[model samples]
Target: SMNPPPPETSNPNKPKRQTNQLQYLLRVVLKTLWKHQFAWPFQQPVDAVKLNLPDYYKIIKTPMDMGTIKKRLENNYYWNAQECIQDFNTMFTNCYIYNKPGDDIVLMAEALEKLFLQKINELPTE
Candidate 1:
């Protein structure tokens, strides 16, 4: 079940309700991407406390590389409608290695990629 949308936050630079489809899509993309892009094992206590997780530790396989996640997104020859190939690409090429397990991280990456393609592919044929 879906929850009601949250109240909007105003950006003083552009204080307007960001209800546009593109804005919404971009938010979802960034939110989902960062939300899932972490694994827990080596995060420090202060960081964990700020995030308020008492039991679950937190770690991001990012510094292992900005976290050039963008690199993975760009290693494409061309794209077809909603391809998860990038997921496989990320997994094989850049997902966590030693001592770290891997699973839906790739799936979520694919979902984000598919979403980007779906949303952007809809731009008027120009």
Candidate 2:
């Protein structure tokens, strides 16, 4: 189930909201691309207070790279839609080394590429 959208924050540094459908689509595409692009191990506190055991103790595979995508979104200087598409292309091309992504990452990468291209076609020429 989906939760209600959070109330708008008062932070003046927040990026402006999307101005049009194209812009909205661009943001979505960039976000999805960012999510599938990286991975890092999840760490737990040594003196943890949680009552339940964690399901994941080490780095696990996932279709989306959450922390990286979140951090990148916070930096407005990093990318715009066009640059994002380019990065997606570049990253997709180099997603593997020595056939390194010979697992589910490949599937996710391929799907993201398709989305990247689809979004690019929606961009308007200057």
Candidate 3:
């Protein structure tokens, strides 16, 4: 006959565990962003040549997109949560810079940014 094990109350490294948990939560937030209606424009890199916007690259020095972020996350390129958030901020900032004020893309970017922030705030904090 085998005896049942008793409950263990050992604590793990809280700081490291929280870091890992944040990464997992960020992944979920990314998935939500992908499904958002305003996600289309940011899903992939802008094809300046194909779209005939020759000056696009000149204006937007650093380009960021959801696809690139997804790849980076998978590769562990972002060591901290802020790094990943910075990329998202970059993507939206680029949109605001390249597009005209009140343009549909700008509006979409604004809406998406709001949603992103809301989701981020909802994440568990220790």
Candidate 4:
């Protein structure tokens, strides 16, 4: 063979590997949030019908939860840390909108938000 298969092309079957440090750190932060006492409510999606709060879906345009976020993270749905953070904020904001200021759920969301803010600051810029 004069051409010799065009100088032996690189193996396309070999997968490309790249490590995303930010994603790793964000996963760690998520794990920490999951362990907190206030995380129980946010761990799963809010059930409007089961809870008898029909208006819940009408009020919350975008429903978010830690479990959903975890699934998204594991599936590589988030392109950056901000996307994950935004989801967390959305989860809390939805709680605030649906619950009274003095409601226990609202208080728990506030506490979790505070902890999230603190942990997010620990992530590296690079």
Candidate 5:
């Protein structure tokens, strides 16, 4: 309202207090604009600090590695053939249903299953 109390205010505990207070003001403005049926594009409230921190902005993602893969299998109890086979089937079924994009993943899974069955049959009796 009142031109955001001077950003130069000397308060060590409240560094960027003006910027922090402006965020609530910004939310109110966005909500009021929505009430008036304005053509606003943003789906969420804008962050005051983030708007100014261009270089500091980043999104974190998990980097998959061998250990991560092993951990997933260990946690899910995917040890035996039936467990692994069900996993393959489920993956292919999901990919095939949700994604129309082309790939031989299911075909490859089927081929690997045939190989597993063939190899299992050839195992010598104890």
Candidate 6:
């Protein structure tokens, strides 16, 4: 995997980003990390790309305490699709889970997308 290709993007937009669908979904993730003393700076188009994966993942996180999100939303409430997207981005951002961390980006991405769809599959008609 010497020359990994650019992530297939629906729209890279005016600035380069580490991932796509940096759209509304990412906002949810960043906001979640914000609760754990992380700042996503998502308003800046290039912030995600500027920071490599390691710093984004294992470094900036709250260390073995990423479960707060699950705890908070266990059996009720809306699963924020936007945040779910951001969580996916955060996982990719974390080098501990991607690249040298011995994980496949494609597989992780597919799982994230699938999880997102599954979570949203049963949302009530609001």
Clashes of each: 0, 1, 0, 0, 0, 2
Ten consecutive residues with minimal summed lDDT in candidate 1? 1-10
**Error of model 6, residue 38, in angstroms:** 26
Candidate 2 C-alpha lDDT tens digits along 20-118: 443543366555554554322111121112423232222212212323333334444233554334434444554442125656656666676686678
Across 1-126, the per-residue lDDT of candidate 3 in tens digits comes to 121221121224322223663465456878888889889878877777657787887788778888777766665555567767888899999999999999999999999899889887876563
Highest TM-score model number: 4
Candidate 3 residues lying further than 4 Å off, grouped into runs, are 1-22
| TM-scores of the models, in the order given | 0.26, 0.41, 0.78, 0.80, 0.25, 0.29
Model 1 whole-model lDDT (C-alpha atoms): 0.33
Between candidates 1 and 2, the one scoring higher on TM-score is 2
Better of 2 and 3 by TM-score: 3
Off-target runs (Cα >4 Å) in candidate 1 are 1-102, 124-126
RMSD of each: 13.1, 10.4, 14.8, 13.8, 25.0, 13.1
Stretches of model 5 off by over 4 angstroms after superposition:
1-76, 101-126
Pick by lDDT: 2 or 3, better one: 3
What TM-score number comes out for model 2? 0.41
| Cα lDDT of model 6 by residue, 1-126, tens digit | 222332222232423333333322234433434343232322222233445433443344422122333332332222444544444445435434434544554444444445545544533333
Give Cα-based local distance difference scores for all models. Answer: 0.33, 0.41, 0.73, 0.73, 0.31, 0.36
Candidate 6 overall lDDT versus native: 0.36
Determine the C-alpha RMSD for candidate 2 after optimal superposition of all C-alphas.
Answer: 10.4
Which ten-residue region of model 4 has the weakest summed lDDT?
A: 1-10
Model 5, 72-94: lDDT tens digits are 33343332334333433343344
Clashing pairs in 4: none
